[PDB]
Design a protein around this nucleic acid. Structure first.
Lengths: 63, 52, 73, 217
RNA sequence: AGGGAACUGAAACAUCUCAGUACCUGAAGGAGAAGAAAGAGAAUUCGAUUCCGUUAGUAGCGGCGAGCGAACCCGGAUCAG
RNA sequence: GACUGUAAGGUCGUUGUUCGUGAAACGAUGACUGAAUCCGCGCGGACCACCGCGCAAGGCUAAAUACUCCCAGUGACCGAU
RNA sequence: UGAAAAACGGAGGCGGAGCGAAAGCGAGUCCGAAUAGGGCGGCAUUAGUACGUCGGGCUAGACUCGAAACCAGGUGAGCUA
RNA sequence: GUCUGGCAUUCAACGUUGAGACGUGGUGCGUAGGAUAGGUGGGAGGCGAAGAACCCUGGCUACGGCUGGGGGGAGCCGCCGGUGAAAUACCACCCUCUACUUUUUGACGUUGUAACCUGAAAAAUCACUUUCGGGGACCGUGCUUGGCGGGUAGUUUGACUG
């Protein structure tokens, strides 16, 4: 019995193997976006640090 | 059902597949001398009630 | 027992549980209701197999004027 | 499949009477005309342009014009249509002006040999907008003659812009009751070929020059 | 089948989970219930219900919250009018 | 052996279904529509186009799945608060 | 089969190159005008997995108990009326 | 619960504004075409004792058109015509579009009787009510709506805290 929380079963979930796990960086986007130009090139699996223990109950059985 | 008619004295007399009233032929137009169709005699006696 | 309509009747299901002004648009609604009811038809009749008194229905006399059992009133 | 065999009975078979038609000099033909609802013609479903000849052999019905060659001339006139030429000895319909409209207006079906799509095509064929005529092929045989007969007495339904299922079929003096299967080999026949099944408007039928009748579902 | 709440959880909290559950009332055999059809599937295949086996604990659902959860491939009892 | 074994889709309000119902056909109801009527008709998750299959119309189907009042026999339990 | 069994059994999922919304791509990878960068097959590399007791946790009241309060049904009102 | 709208157990008619269809059909000014064109198949003969060339004349004209009668009473129209996106009438014609001879539809007001209920006759307040007076589409149930409503319900009502 495991539900796998589908929401945060989307986003980053894919596993790596024998190195480091992914994440999501997430900036602000949306409106008034007329400035900045760096994270503009930095968005996807923005690694957090190591807090990927919570997320597991999100999914971990036949993706 | 098929309406039809033969007993006149009120709006023509011939037969027809039209029902002005809300289906109330046989509920008032039968217990006072009428009939107003209620059988199958209009797939006979509607071909077989006009010849010569 | 000479209560419900001889035909088929309606009762024994039917509830509510609707909302109050909100149908997916601005703000997720609450709920507010969640209760019981039921439905019944009407009168007028003549005869069919097994005479007692009469109850009939609504949508059971309109086209219900063929499957008789012995009558002509 | 407008209807089964029993459809063109009381629909297309009436001319002998009084108040109805007219007692002319010679017996006429029969007409089939309907009345449609609106118009639509370029992506879906109209324009009936089929290959529907006729089994039985009537009389001088429609006319044909042939542009064979020099080895297929006389053997392409066994029906006395209008006029047939050859190949080389045929360059009169590409010089004048008005006289050109005398070999395309009164010729219903065509029987042009497969070796003539220009000498008579854009000159007296697909150019006829109103009449709606064009060139059609022939069977695959080293002989071209009988196909001429099995094509004139035929009946075509030109596509254009008229709200009516015009379905010529022959005449009316011999045995009009010959619709035992010939009439069934025209409209009703087209059902294992075309792509149809439901939705055209009402169906009408009538006499020639008198009044109009009706059909049924 | 007529049948219908509810303490709880969401760390409180009307859609919700309990669910159609407590209870009432009707039926017969110790078998009734779905079960041979205006059908499931999907490569241009396969027939009669249900159960568990495996999937899928996937798709979806969803104060988008906990949460409920088929069909795609599978066994036998049965592969019978 | 005594009988004779072959005469309804739909709209609006909604319950369910996994689907809290809305970006979706499908069970059905509250008042309105009983059309199609056969190469016509039911849907593939609204519709367009083509395919797939099934045809108003009423049920029987034992066998297993799930049950545990009684009759033998059977288990690394208690011990007559 | 049968007072053990058991081989027979790929329904099947987990490990498995990955990344990418995914598509799809590809032993290399999302950016677009792309030697400079985070992850990866990679790699001075475990590619593993199943049984058991067991670290925490989990689907359940399932560490037990102590609350006045909400409900279905049913019982007398000979208590005060 | 109570206040309001929607269809049926409320039938022909009647003074009716609106509305859909069937029927004739029916506005269209690119010269010219006997003639000012978004039309097809059939076609050899179209109109006329239900009165047809021609004239007077009244109504919407960006100046095309929609009808009668009478004045003249037995005379006007298809084909080798041209040009036009097309040659035509007779049976049809969809478009922005119309006034009725029929039908259906909120109706406002008016007679009658087929839902219904209140006063005699057969064991007398129900149940049949037999001819019942009666008024009659009203009273009302259904699903939907708005308002009110602590009548009833689940919760919040935040917390901090020298």
């Amino acid at each position: 019995p495991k539900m796998k929380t589908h929401k945060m079963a989307k986003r980053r979930i894919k596993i790596t193997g024998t190195g480091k796990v992914m994440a999501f960086k997430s900036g602000k986007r949306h409106q008034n976006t007329g400035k900045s130009g760096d994270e503009i090139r930095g968005k996807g699996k923005g690694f957090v640090l190591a807090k990927a223990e919570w997320a597991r109950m999100k999914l971990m059985l036949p993706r | 059902m098929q309406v039809i008619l033969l007993e006149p004295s009120r709006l023509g007399k011939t037969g027809e597949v039209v029902s002005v009233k809300d289906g109330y032929a046989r509920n008032w137009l039968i217990p006072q001398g009428l009939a107003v169709s209620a059988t199958r005699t209009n797939m006979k006696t509607l071909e077989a009630q006009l010849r010569s | 027992m000479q209560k419900d309509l001889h035909p088929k009747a309606v009762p024994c299901k039917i509830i509510y549980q609707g909302q109050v002004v909100m149908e997916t648009m601005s703000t997720r609604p609450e709920i507010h209701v969640d209760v019981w009811s039921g439905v019944h038809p009407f009168w007028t009749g003549e005869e069919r197999f097994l005479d007692t008194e009469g109850r009939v229905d609504k949508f059971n006399k309109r086209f219900g004027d063929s499957y008789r059992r012995g009558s002509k009133k | 499949m407008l209807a089964d065999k029993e459809s063109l009975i009381e629909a297309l078979k009436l001319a002998l009477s009084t108040e109805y038609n007219v007692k002319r000099n010679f017996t006429q033909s029969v007409e089939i005309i309907l009345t449609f609802k609106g118009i639509d013609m370029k992506k879906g479903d109209l324009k009936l342009r089929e290959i529907v000849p006729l089994p039985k052999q009537p009389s001088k019905a429609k006319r044909v014009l042939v542009v064979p060659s020099s080895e297929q001339l006389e053997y392409a006139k066994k029906a006395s249509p209008k006029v047939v030429i050859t190949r080389e000895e045929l360059q009169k319909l590409q010089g004048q002006k008005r006289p050109v409209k005398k070999l395309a207006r009164q010729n219903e079906w065509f029987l042009i040999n497969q070796e003539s799509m220009a000498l008579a095509g854009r000159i007296l064929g697909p150019a006829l907008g109103p009449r709606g005529k064009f060139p059609t092929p022939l069977p695959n045989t080293a002989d071209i003659s009988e196909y001429i007969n099995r094509f004139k007495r035929s009946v075509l339904v030109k596509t254009k812009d008229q709200p009516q299922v015009q379905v010529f079929i022959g005449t009316e003096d011999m045995k009009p009751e010959d619709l035992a299967e010939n009439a069934i080999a025209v409209l009703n026949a087209i059902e294992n070929k075309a792509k149809v099944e439901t939705n055209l408007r009402n169906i009408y039928v009538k006499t020639t020059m008198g009044k109009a009748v009706k059909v049924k579902r």
